[model samples]
Target: ARGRLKVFLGAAPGVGKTYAMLQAAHAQLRQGVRVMAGVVETHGRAETEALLNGLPQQPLLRTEYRGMTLEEMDLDALLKAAPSLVLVDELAHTNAPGSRHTKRWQDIQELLAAGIDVYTTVNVQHLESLNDQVRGITGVQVRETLPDWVLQEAFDLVLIDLPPRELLERLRDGKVYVPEQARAAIDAFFTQTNLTALREMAMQTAAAQ
Candidate 1:
């Protein structure tokens, strides 16, 4: 793994990190570099899905647990395809109830070990050390998480952000989550109060870098 692994991190789901990552990937691809998509979640967002119009993508690896099939980033398939750069979305996702790895970060480890460069999306709230703080701030607990070691190991961290209102607008406009989720997202985690706090946290994290 001579190449660096870049992580595009944000505070929440609609903070524009995915857009930024896609933009970068497109630019690199146009430069004649070999790029591939290991896994991506459009989540019914038109803007995000629209970005994938003609881009080549790798087949998602499937795993079976308790007679149920689960969709996950196909680690083996990604390694077999072996592109110079692979874009992975939702780095903090928890693998299905039963899988070879408990967390997506672990799958990322194997990808890096295979000597492929990677670019991925993540939310700052998933950073292990800050997970508790995120819970405290929002008054809710998080289950899936990424360990601090993974954060330290990333070759680069790019923090992306948008004002709470702007993000909410993006969600409403289907630039982020789907229309249904955008409706429900107005409350819960993306409230004005919490969004302000999350934005500040993103600012502080960038300062530390």
Candidate 2:
């Protein structure tokens, strides 16, 4: 049987979706389920680090490009490992230069084709259908996006929401970014108005699903 795909959708960063995914994985582990991490990008915080304890993580493939080192989800290795479920973060990320797939979502497609379940996270701004609308609001073109069909086909489309004001608070408190960069982030991308619109889009998209 083809394995399932579960996605956690968020309006913006710091909505706690990734952390919630971790909790679910941890619960699965407690139940003796085989779950592994294909990729999880962290901000080097103890709280986030602590959440990852006791979970098995697949090794990442590192590549050098333009004098910088980049890490990619090792799709071939993950296919070999074939765990019951895999947690892959940043669904809209672009693959490293020499990866098998140009986009991370394509890798996810392969994993599902191989009958390995996947749980992943993404933000509303990265949905291809809503790409223009988001850019209209924020005046920033999002480079990485996936087709809307991915959302429609997911086994579960979960909307992880937080009030705009609360999300702002999280940013101010340095949960989303470091203190020095928090204000600038809020000014640029985390405005309450933009977040509210994004949240509405996320809810409407999942409701349709």
Candidate 3:
């Protein structure tokens, strides 16, 4: 049997997709499930980092590229560990230059084939089918996207929703990004209108499933 996949889908960044995933992992852990962190990116958020406590983490694959070391999920190690459930953040991320797969979702495919259930995170804008629409709405082209089927076929698609106002508040509070980056984000993609449209898209996507 193929392992199940559960994705925590967010409308935009800072909506707490990873935080929700960690909470779910903790729930599963309490039930005695063998849960392991495949690769969780806290992105310097203290709260998100705190939830990582007690969960066993699979060692990452480190690759040196142009004098810069890049760390990515070690698919082979996760398969070897064979935990019942594994947490993987940023499902649309592109792998380093020398990875077994070019995309993280491909790595996830292998893990599912090996029957290791996965819990992952992604934003609505990362859905390939909605790419152009998102760009039209937000005026920003999302370069990294996963096939719509990957999300459609998931056993569970959880929408990590937050009102645009609240999300903007979080962004301003520097919970999502540094002050300077937050200002740029607010100017670019975090506008009230843009976030509202994205939030609607996220809800519709979840509704479709």
User: Where does candidate 2 stray beyond 4 Å?
Assistant: 178-186
**Residues 115-165 of candidate 3: C-alpha lDDT, one tens digit per residue:** 989999998998999999988987777888899999999999999999999
lDDT of 2 by residue, 36-73 (tens): 99998666656667877668999889999999889999
Question: What are the per-model C-alpha RMSD values against the true structure?
Answer: 2.8, 2.3, 2.1
For model 1 the local lDDT of residue 202 reads: 71
lDDT of 1: 0.77
The regions of model 1 sitting more than 4 angstroms off are 63-69, 173-175, 178-186
**TM-scores for the candidates:** 0.87, 0.93, 0.94
Superposition error at 125 for model 2 (Å): 0.5
Per-model lDDT: 0.77, 0.85, 0.89
Please report the candidate that would top lDDT against the real structure. Answer: 3
Candidate 3 collision pairs? none
